[PDB]
Structures are given as structure tokens and as C-alpha cells.
Design an enzyme around this catalytic site. Structure first.
Site, PDB file in Angstrom:
ATOM      1  N   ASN A   1       0.821  -1.213   0.000  1.00 38.12           N
ATOM      2  CA  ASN A   1       0.000   0.000   0.000  1.00 38.12           C
ATOM      3  C   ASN A   1       0.853   1.259   0.000  1.00 38.12           C
ATOM      4  OD1 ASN A   1      -0.413   1.768   2.700  1.00 38.12           O
ATOM      5  ND2 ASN A   1       0.234  -0.314   3.278  1.00 38.12           N
ATOM      6  N   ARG A   2       0.299   2.304  -0.628  1.00 41.96           N
ATOM      7  CA  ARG A   2       0.874   3.630  -0.523  1.00 41.96           C
ATOM      8  C   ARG A   2      -0.259   4.652  -0.357  1.00 41.96           C
ATOM      9  NH1 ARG A   2       2.596   2.191  -5.989  1.00 41.96           N
ATOM     10  NH2 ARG A   2       1.251   3.153  -7.585  1.00 41.96           N
ATOM     11  N   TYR A   3      -1.123   4.410   0.630  1.00 41.44           N
ATOM     12  CA  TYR A   3      -2.266   5.311   0.881  1.00 41.44           C
ATOM     13  C   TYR A   3      -1.819   6.748   1.075  1.00 41.44           C
ATOM     14  CZ  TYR A   3      -6.522   2.416   1.416  1.00 41.44           C
ATOM     15  OH  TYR A   3      -7.641   1.642   1.215  1.00 41.44           O
TER      16      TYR A   3
ATOM     17  N   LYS B   1       5.594   3.413  17.241  1.00 42.13           N
ATOM     18  CA  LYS B   1       5.515   2.338  16.257  1.00 42.13           C
ATOM     19  C   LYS B   1       6.660   2.467  15.277  1.00 42.13           C
ATOM     20  CE  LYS B   1       2.384   0.046  13.034  1.00 42.13           C
ATOM     21  NZ  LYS B   1       0.949  -0.005  12.621  1.00 42.13           N
TER      22      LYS B   1
ATOM     23  N   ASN C   1       5.349   5.847   3.557  1.00 40.92           N
ATOM     24  CA  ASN C   1       4.600   6.600   2.517  1.00 40.92           C
ATOM     25  C   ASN C   1       4.433   8.101   2.734  1.00 40.92           C
ATOM     26  OD1 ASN C   1       4.224   4.157   1.103  1.00 40.92           O
ATOM     27  ND2 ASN C   1       2.486   3.655   2.453  1.00 40.92           N
ATOM     28  N   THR C   2       5.183   8.652   3.684  1.00 41.48           N
ATOM     29  CA  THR C   2       5.241  10.106   3.864  1.00 41.48           C
ATOM     30  C   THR C   2       6.715  10.508   3.889  1.00 41.48           C
ATOM     31  OG1 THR C   2       3.101  10.179   5.023  1.00 41.48           O
ATOM     32  CG2 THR C   2       4.541  12.105   5.300  1.00 41.48           C
TER      33      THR C   2
ATOM     34  N   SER D   1       5.598   5.072   8.894  1.00 41.46           N
ATOM     35  CA  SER D   1       4.995   4.948   7.573  1.00 41.46           C
ATOM     36  C   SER D   1       6.064   5.089   6.488  1.00 41.46           C
ATOM     37  CB  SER D   1       3.949   6.027   7.329  1.00 41.46           C
ATOM     38  OG  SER D   1       3.528   5.932   5.973  1.00 41.46           O
TER      39      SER D   1
ATOM     40  N   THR E   1       5.826  -4.408  14.052  1.00 42.24           N
ATOM     41  CA  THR E   1       6.347  -3.311  13.237  1.00 42.24           C
ATOM     42  C   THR E   1       5.312  -2.810  12.227  1.00 42.24           C
ATOM     43  OG1 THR E   1       7.069  -4.725  11.358  1.00 42.24           O
ATOM     44  CG2 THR E   1       8.678  -4.404  13.129  1.00 42.24           C
ATOM     45  N   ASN E   2       5.624  -1.671  11.603  1.00 38.12           N
ATOM     46  CA  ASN E   2       4.926  -1.203  10.427  1.00 38.12           C
ATOM     47  C   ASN E   2       5.297  -2.070   9.198  1.00 38.12           C
ATOM     48  OD1 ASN E   2       3.404   0.662   8.675  1.00 38.12           O
ATOM     49  ND2 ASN E   2       3.895   2.250  10.226  1.00 38.12           N
TER      50      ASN E   2
ATOM     51  N   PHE F   1      -1.412   8.331   4.161  1.00 42.45           N
ATOM     52  CA  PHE F   1      -2.117   9.001   5.294  1.00 42.45           C
ATOM     53  C   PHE F   1      -3.373   9.761   4.809  1.00 42.45           C
ATOM     54  CE2 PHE F   1       1.707   9.777   8.511  1.00 42.45           C
ATOM     55  CZ  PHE F   1       1.572   8.447   8.979  1.00 42.45           C
TER      56      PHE F   1
HETATM   57  C1  LIG Z   1      -3.635  -0.920   3.636  1.00 43.18           C
HETATM   58  C2  LIG Z   1      -2.827  -0.633   4.900  1.00 43.18           C
HETATM   59  C3  LIG Z   1      -2.926   0.611   5.533  1.00 43.18           C
HETATM   60  C4  LIG Z   1      -2.177   0.887   6.684  1.00 43.18           C
HETATM   61  N1  LIG Z   1      -2.259   2.090   7.335  1.00 43.18           N
HETATM   62  C5  LIG Z   1      -1.547   2.290   8.481  1.00 43.18           C
HETATM   63  C6  LIG Z   1      -1.626   3.552   9.221  1.00 43.18           C
HETATM   64  O1  LIG Z   1      -2.386   4.453   8.780  1.00 43.18           O
HETATM   65  N2  LIG Z   1      -0.886   3.682  10.325  1.00 43.18           N
HETATM   66  C7  LIG Z   1      -0.072   2.696  10.787  1.00 43.18           C
HETATM   67  O2  LIG Z   1       0.587   2.910  11.818  1.00 43.18           O
HETATM   68  N3  LIG Z   1       0.067   1.504  10.173  1.00 43.18           N
HETATM   69  C8  LIG Z   1      -0.648   1.246   9.058  1.00 43.18           C
HETATM   70  N4  LIG Z   1      -0.574   0.020   8.403  1.00 43.18           N
HETATM   71  C9  LIG Z   1       0.312  -1.020   8.928  1.00 43.18           C
HETATM   72  C10 LIG Z   1      -0.396  -2.040   9.800  1.00 43.18           C
HETATM   73  O3  LIG Z   1      -0.846  -1.359  10.966  1.00 43.18           O
HETATM   74  C11 LIG Z   1       0.599  -3.143  10.203  1.00 43.18           C
HETATM   75  O4  LIG Z   1       1.694  -2.556  10.951  1.00 43.18           O
HETATM   76  C12 LIG Z   1       1.206  -3.881   8.993  1.00 43.18           C
HETATM   77  O5  LIG Z   1       0.257  -3.994   7.910  1.00 43.18           O
HETATM   78  C13 LIG Z   1       1.743  -5.275   9.393  1.00 43.18           C
HETATM   79  O6  LIG Z   1       0.642  -6.102   9.823  1.00 43.18           O
HETATM   80  P1  LIG Z   1      -0.097  -7.166   8.852  1.00 43.18           P
HETATM   81  O7  LIG Z   1       1.010  -7.963   8.181  1.00 43.18           O
HETATM   82  O8  LIG Z   1      -0.880  -8.050   9.786  1.00 43.18           O
HETATM   83  O9  LIG Z   1      -0.938  -6.402   7.863  1.00 43.18           O
HETATM   84  C14 LIG Z   1      -1.324  -0.203   7.234  1.00 43.18           C
HETATM   85  C15 LIG Z   1      -1.232  -1.446   6.595  1.00 43.18           C
HETATM   86  C16 LIG Z   1      -1.960  -1.699   5.458  1.00 43.18           C
HETATM   87  C17 LIG Z   1      -1.867  -3.061   4.793  1.00 43.18           C
HETATM   88  C1  LIG Z   2     -19.805 -10.544   6.040  1.00 47.88           C
HETATM   89  O1  LIG Z   2     -18.580 -10.366   5.312  1.00 47.88           O
HETATM   90  C2  LIG Z   2     -17.632  -9.456   5.746  1.00 47.88           C
HETATM   91  C3  LIG Z   2     -17.862  -8.692   6.895  1.00 47.88           C
HETATM   92  C4  LIG Z   2     -16.900  -7.775   7.322  1.00 47.88           C
HETATM   93  C5  LIG Z   2     -15.729  -7.617   6.586  1.00 47.88           C
HETATM   94  C6  LIG Z   2     -15.471  -8.396   5.451  1.00 47.88           C
HETATM   95  C7  LIG Z   2     -14.210  -8.099   4.727  1.00 47.88           C
HETATM   96  C8  LIG Z   2     -14.300  -7.935   3.348  1.00 47.88           C
HETATM   97  C9  LIG Z   2     -13.182  -7.576   2.602  1.00 47.88           C
HETATM   98  F1  LIG Z   2     -13.281  -7.439   1.279  1.00 47.88           F
HETATM   99  C10 LIG Z   2     -11.954  -7.352   3.218  1.00 47.88           C
HETATM  100  N1  LIG Z   2     -10.886  -6.995   2.447  1.00 47.88           N
HETATM  101  C11 LIG Z   2     -10.236  -5.813   2.633  1.00 47.88           C
HETATM  102  O2  LIG Z   2     -10.549  -5.042   3.546  1.00 47.88           O
HETATM  103  N2  LIG Z   2      -9.210  -5.507   1.818  1.00 47.88           N
HETATM  104  C12 LIG Z   2      -8.330  -4.523   2.144  1.00 47.88           C
HETATM  105  C13 LIG Z   2      -8.239  -3.642   3.220  1.00 47.88           C
HETATM  106  N3  LIG Z   2      -7.176  -2.783   3.142  1.00 47.88           N
HETATM  107  C14 LIG Z   2      -6.351  -2.919   2.053  1.00 47.88           C
HETATM  108  S1  LIG Z   2      -6.995  -4.221   1.083  1.00 47.88           S
HETATM  109  C15 LIG Z   2     -11.871  -7.511   4.599  1.00 47.88           C
HETATM  110  F2  LIG Z   2     -10.692  -7.297   5.185  1.00 47.88           F
HETATM  111  C16 LIG Z   2     -12.985  -7.863   5.374  1.00 47.88           C
HETATM  112  C17 LIG Z   2     -16.445  -9.298   5.007  1.00 47.88           C
HETATM  113  O1  LIG Z   3      -1.228   5.639   4.946  1.00 55.40           O
HETATM  114  C1  LIG Z   3      -0.297   4.897   4.600  1.00 55.40           C
HETATM  115  O2  LIG Z   3       0.200   4.943   3.455  1.00 55.40           O
HETATM  116  C2  LIG Z   3       0.394   3.968   5.552  1.00 55.40           C
HETATM  117  C3  LIG Z   3       0.768   4.418   6.812  1.00 55.40           C
HETATM  118  C4  LIG Z   3       1.489   3.512   7.616  1.00 55.40           C
HETATM  119  O3  LIG Z   3       1.845   3.840   8.765  1.00 55.40           O
HETATM  120  N1  LIG Z   3       1.827   2.305   7.148  1.00 55.40           N
HETATM  121  C5  LIG Z   3       1.486   1.918   5.904  1.00 55.40           C
HETATM  122  O4  LIG Z   3       1.830   0.779   5.468  1.00 55.40           O
HETATM  123  N2  LIG Z   3       0.786   2.754   5.099  1.00 55.40           N
END
Ligand SMILES: Cc1cc2nc3c(=O)[nH]c(=O)nc-3n(C[C@H](O)[C@H](O)[C@H](O)COP(=O)(O)O)c2cc1C
Ligand SMILES: COc1cccc(-c2cc(F)c(NC(=O)Nc3cncs3)c(F)c2)c1
Ligand SMILES: O=C(O)c1cc(=O)[nH]c(=O)[nH]1
Length: 365
Positions: free
Chosen positions: A114-116, A224, A186-187, A184, A252-253, A118
Site C-alpha cells: 500500500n501507498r495510501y 511504532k 509513505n510520507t 509509515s 512493526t509497520n 495518510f
Molecule cells: C492498507 C494498509 C494501511 C495501513 N495504514 C496504516 C496507518 O495508517 N498507520 C499505521 O501505523 N500503520 C498502518 N498500516 C500497517 C499495519 O498497521 C501493520 O503494521 C502492517 O500492515 C503489518 O501487519 P499485517 O502484516 O498483519 O498487515 C497499514 C497497513 C496496510 C496493509
Molecule cells: C460478512 O462479510 C464481511 C464482513 C466484514 C468484513 C469483510 C471483509 C471484506 C473484505 F473485502 C476485506 N478486504 C479488505 O478489507 N481488503 C483490504 C483492506 N485494506 C487494504 S486491502 C476484509 F478485510 C474484510 C467481510
Molecule cells: O497511509 C499509509 O500509506 C500507511 C501508513 C502507515 O503507517 N503504514 C502503511 O503501510 N501505510
């Protein structure tokens, strides 16, 4: 369960085949905010309870920051079975984030990039949203279901420390814990806030602001960190955390690295990588940070957790609590009960009386 297999084998792959990841995210937040969920039957057993950060946590499995960036789905997330919810990151002013597309699925790797950037409704909007359910949250917290708020910085901010200070003042009174997100990918310039002199100055200001809040409205403060830090960076962070009395670390992030072996067609997109390829990088960072802080600083472990084994590995490495995000995108809501049930079984098998006994267990071997 039948729900686990149904979500993992049928519902989730279908949603993924129909929707790009950002649309899937927005849909997930909507369904969750409405409580349209399989509603886990798993009763949390006493062996999953953890006391840390000045709170009781009914279970140690939380939803990581970024899933509910704007605090829209908090109650639905507790209904899903998470022991604690972290919202954010929230920036002082609203901002749109990066142009779309900015979220990419790597299904062959069980990963996301991801590269949202913030994208945030901003502090005022989130403040009012949390105020509207503040007493409901007070009850949830009392019942072992705490709320964390993750703070970010605006893209055009001319003073990073003042952005974080504003978040402490505005959302601190509504949070059980705050997270200073200096990791992050991405900033521009954000991760250099992890360096020693800059981090000490920043965290001194954050802690001063936190300490100026009234007693009942005074949150724990956590930092974090990235999984991409040098050994020097990690030593410096550990030293500052101990010098200032920071309450905890989130480890971690996402990673800006791209481990050898990634198969997804989208592996070379810019952004942070999450999910399975991050898992052991994150566990090892937990292990190092726990050792550097002598086991005296609570760690929330996050990165690639999708099973009870993954959770327990992080706990044994030094995490008091864990979070997941990416696994939810692949397995759906039933993954929460799955992790909890598998974790309980493993704790029993390994002769731990409860989660608390397992924290840092690898360092005592
Ligand atoms: C789509 C997305 C958006 C995220 N946005 C944030 C954020 O706004 N702030 C933050 O601290 N971490 C953010 N993260 C990082 C998650 O909090 C977490 O640290 C990371 O995804 C590792 O956990 P996972 O492998 O279970 O996803 C984001 C991760 C993903 C995938
Ligand atoms: C009754 O069914 C349910 C109820 C509640 C939640 C879901 C549910 C559906 C979804 F498509 C996803 N997928 C994502 O959020 N994708 C992503 C999020 N950030 C980057 S990609 C999920 F995580 C959860 C289904
Ligand atoms: O908003 C984002 O791009 C974002 C923030 C963050 O802390 N970590 C991440 O993976 N994406």
C-alpha cells in the site's frame, strides 16, 4: 469451523475477484460499521487475558492501524472478536492521500503493498466521531476492550512535533493509548524521525503534552517502528524509550524491502509490504527490541500474523499483545476466532498457564 472454510475458500476469493483492494477495503469498513458479520461464537477464555499498559485486555489479538483509519467501525471490530482496536493514523488536518490506485494485492505471497499516504478525515472529524460513543467506549475499556489511537503528520506540515502534539491534545483524552507513528514508508521524511536526536526531541514534546492531560484522560504513549531499521537505529530507539519512559512499542509497520522470492506480479509497486513476507522480519525485530529494553517495555507485535502459531511466536519473542490486518483481507472475519482458538490450544500444549506466562519465553530458554 464451517464459517472459517466458507470465508477462506468461497466468500473472500469471490470478493477479491470482483473488487480492487481499495474498494474491498471501503466495503469491509461499511459492513463492519453496520455489524454485518458472522459474529464469532468463540468465548474468550481466562487464559487469553493480559494486563498491560494500565489496562485489562480480554484477549491479546487487536486490529492494526490503517484498517479503520477514521474511527468508523470500532464497535463492529469488537463484535468481530478483537481484544482491542487501534484506529488511525489520523492527521491534524484532513488530507486525501496519494492518487489511486494505491493498494495492491499479492495473492501468491499472501501479501499487500500500500501507498495510501495518510488519507485522513483529520482530527476534528475523528474527535467528534469518538465523542459520540465516548461513554460506550469507557464501558468497553472497563470490560477489557481498550481503544488505541494512532497519530500521523500532514504531508505539508512544517513542524512534525507540533502535528503529533496536536493529536495528543485532541485525541489523547479519548484513547486508552496513543501511537506515535514515525514509521509509515509513505510520507516523505517521516521515518528519519526514528533517528536519536530527532526522536528524543519529538518524544519529549509528545510526553509533555500527554502529561498535561487530566488524570482520567491520560493515555499510554507507544512508538511504532519500521522493520527496516539498522542495528544502530534499534539501539538508539531502545535508549530513548528507556530514557524518556515511553510506555510501549509497536513492532512493526510495513516494510519497504522486497524479500527475495516474492511472486506477485505487483511486487515492484512502491509502498509498504505487509502480510506473510513481513512475518519473520517483524518477529526478529520484536526479539531484538525486547532484548534491548530488557523485557521492561511492553511490545505490541504486528506483521504477518494469520494463525495462533504466528501469534505465539511473537508473544514468545517478547510481545505482550499482537495485531493483524492483512490476514483479515485474505481469510475474512473468521480469522480472528481462528487465531484465538489456535493460540489457546498452543499455550496448553506448550505448558503455559496463560498468555502472560508465554511473554518473552524464548529469551528465558
Ligand atoms: C492498507 C494498509 C494501511 C495501513 N495504514 C496504516 C496507518 O495508517 N498507520 C499505521 O501505523 N500503520 C498502518 N498500516 C500497517 C499495519 O498497521 C501493520 O503494521 C502492517 O500492515 C503489518 O501487519 P499485517 O502484516 O498483519 O498487515 C497499514 C497497513 C496496510 C496493509
Ligand atoms: C460478512 O462479510 C464481511 C464482513 C466484514 C468484513 C469483510 C471483509 C471484506 C473484505 F473485502 C476485506 N478486504 C479488505 O478489507 N481488503 C483490504 C483492506 N485494506 C487494504 S486491502 C476484509 F478485510 C474484510 C467481510
Ligand atoms: O497511509 C499509509 O500509506 C500507511 C501508513 C502507515 O503507517 N503504514 C502503511 O503501510 N501505510
Amino acid at each position: 469451523t464451517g464459517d472459517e472454510r466458507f470465508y477462506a475458500e468461497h466468500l473472500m476469493p469471490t470478493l477479491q475477484g470482483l473488487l480492487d483492494p481499495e474498494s474491498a477495503h471501503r466495503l469491509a469498513v461499511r459492513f463492519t460499521s453496520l455489524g454485518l458479520l458472522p459474529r464469532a461464537r468463540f468465548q474468550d477464555s481466562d487464559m487469553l487475558e493480559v494486563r498491560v499498559l494500565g489496562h485489562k485486555f480480554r484477549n491479546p489479538v487487536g486490529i492494526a492501524a490503517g484498517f479503520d483509519k477514521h474511527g468508523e467501525a470500532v464497535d463492529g471490530l469488537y463484535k468481530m472478536g478483537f481484544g482491542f482496536v487501534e484506529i488511525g493514523s489520523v492527521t491534524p488536518k484532513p488530507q486525501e492521500g496519494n492518487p489511486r490506485p494505491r493498494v495492491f494485492r499479492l495473492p501468491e505471497d499472501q501479501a499487500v503493498i500500500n501507498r495510501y499516504g495518510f488519507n485522513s478525515h483529520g482530527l476534528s472529524v475523528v474527535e467528534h466521531r469518538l465523542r459520540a460513543r465516548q461513554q460506550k467506549q469507557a464501558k468497553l475499556t472497563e470490560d477489557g476492550l481498550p481503544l488505541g489511537v494512532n497519530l500521523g503528520k500532514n504531508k505539508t506540515s512544517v513542524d512534525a512535533a507540533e502535528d503529533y502534539a496536536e493529536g495528543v491534545r485532541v485525541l489523547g483524552p479519548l484513547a486508552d493509548y496513543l501511537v506515535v507513528n514515525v514509521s509509515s514508508p509513505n510520507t516523505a521524511g517521516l521515518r528519519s524521525l526514528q533517528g536519536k536526536a530527532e526522536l528524543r526531541r519529538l518524544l519529549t514534546k509528545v510526553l509533555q503534552e500527554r502529561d498535561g492531560l487530566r488524570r482520567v484522560h491520560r493515555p499510554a504513549v507507544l512508538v511504532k517502528i519500521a522493520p527496516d531499521l539498522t542495528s544502530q537505529d534499534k539501539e538508539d530507539i531502545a535508549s530513548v524509550v528507556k530514557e524518556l519512559g515511553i510506555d510501549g512499542l509497536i513492532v512493526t509497520n510495513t516494510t519497504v524491502s522486497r524479500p527475495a522470492g516474492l511472486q506477485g506480479a505487483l511486487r515492484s509497486e512502491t509502498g509498504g509490504l505487509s502480510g506473510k513476507p513481513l512475518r519473520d522480519l517483524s518477529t526478529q525485530t520484536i526479539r531484538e527490541m525486547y532484548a534491548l529494553t530488557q523485557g521492561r517495555v511492553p511490545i505490541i507485535g504486528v506483521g504477518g500474523v494469520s494463525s495462533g502459531q504466528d501469534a505465539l511466536e511473537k508473544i514468545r519473542a517478547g510481545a505482550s499483545l499482537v495485531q493483524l490486518y492483512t490476514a483479515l483481507t485474505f481469510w475474512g472475519p473468521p480469522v480472528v476466532g481462528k487465531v484465538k482458538r489456535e493460540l489457546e490450544a498452543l499455550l496448553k500444549e506448550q505448558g503455559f498457564g496463560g498468555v502472560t506466562d508465554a511473554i518473552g519465553a524464548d529469551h528465558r530458554r
